[PDB]
Structure 1
Amino acid sequence: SHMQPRLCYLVKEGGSYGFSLKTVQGKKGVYMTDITPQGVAMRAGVLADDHLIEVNGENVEDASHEEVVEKVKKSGSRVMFLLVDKEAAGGGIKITKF
């Protein structure tokens, strides 16, 4: 659930990075999904429903699905992501103990 993002460096192997990018209804930017077991992404620390903040140092928080795909395709055989998890990417939560 952390407010400490992950830096994940992926090198393509066997023709695939082992992730898919999706959009989510009424949410900005793009998200990881379909993290293949033992694939490059899972091995690099990528998590399902991670939210992409940066691709190779470039902010993608406000980018379209297509923009991010292009950015990742332009990267070729290696790519770096700055990622925050599903819980960080959700709406803020206030909790008071009683």
Structure 2
Amino acid sequence: GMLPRLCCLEKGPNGYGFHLHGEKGKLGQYIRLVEPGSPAEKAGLLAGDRLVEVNGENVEKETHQQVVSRIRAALNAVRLLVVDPETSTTL
């Protein structure tokens, strides 16, 4: 499809089941290590995705800690707007 994928996760007993990682001296958070059978896997999340929005807010210019805080403060449901970095660029 033309729109970025929107992954809608409901928190489970072992969390969401994915890792979030940022680079050295550069903004942008990426998905890593999507656990098999997790809410992240069921929602369509894939390691290698770049995270663009959390619950309708753009997180491309925020620090790693700011993005983690947004995810954790949410009431156990997150909508993650993600893109494939190989084909997608922010300008």
Same fold (TM over 0.5): yes
CA distance in 2, matches of 1:55, 1:26: 22
CA distance in 2, matches of 1:40, 1:9: 9
Provide the aligned length of Structure 1 versus Structure 2: 90
> Which residue is 1:10 aligned to?
9
1:67 Cα deviation after fit: 0.3
Kept in 2, the 8 Å contact 1:52–1:84? The answer is yes
> Which residue is 2:86 aligned to?
87
The CA RMSD over aligned residues, in Å, is 2.0
1:74 Cα deviation after fit: 1.0
> Unmatched 5+ residue regions in structure 2?
none
Q: Which runs of 4+ in 1 moved over 6 A?
A: none
Deviations 1:41-76 (A, max 9, x none): 011000101111100000001111000000001113
Percent of aligned positions with the same letter in both sequences?
A: 43
| TM-score (normalised: structure 2) | 0.86
| TM-score (normalised: structure 1) | 0.81
1:10 maps to amino acid? L
1:11 maps to amino acid? E
| Rg (Cα) greater in structure | 1
> Which residue is 1:96 aligned to?
none
1:85 Cα deviation after fit: 1.6
1:34 maps to amino acid? L
> Unmatched 5+ residue regions in structure 1?
92-98
1:25 Cα deviation after fit: 3.7
CA distance in 1, matches of 2:28, 2:40: 19
